């Protein structure tokens, strides 16, 4: 097994890094992962974001 690269965003509301953390952190961990690394997405507001994308590694 090797790291999985993938991408989340979402159309209905901006969210904040932590949110995106989060999200990325979780995701992972529900495919049996650690997330290793992750960037924002489509900066929206003045301080947030629409998605993030990362990648997770086998645990």
Not at 1 to 22: G, N, P, S
Not at 38 to 51: A, E, Q, S, T, V
Request: glycine fraction near 6%; charged fraction near 25%.
């Amino acid at each position: 097994e090797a790291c999985k690269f993938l991408h989340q965003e979402r159309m209905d509301v901006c969210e904040t890094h932590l949110h995106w953390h989060t999200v990325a952190k979780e995701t992972c961990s529900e495919k049996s992962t650690n997330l290793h690394d992750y960037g924002m997405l489509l900066p929206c507001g003045i301080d947030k974001f629409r998605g993030v994308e990362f990648v997770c590694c086998p645990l």
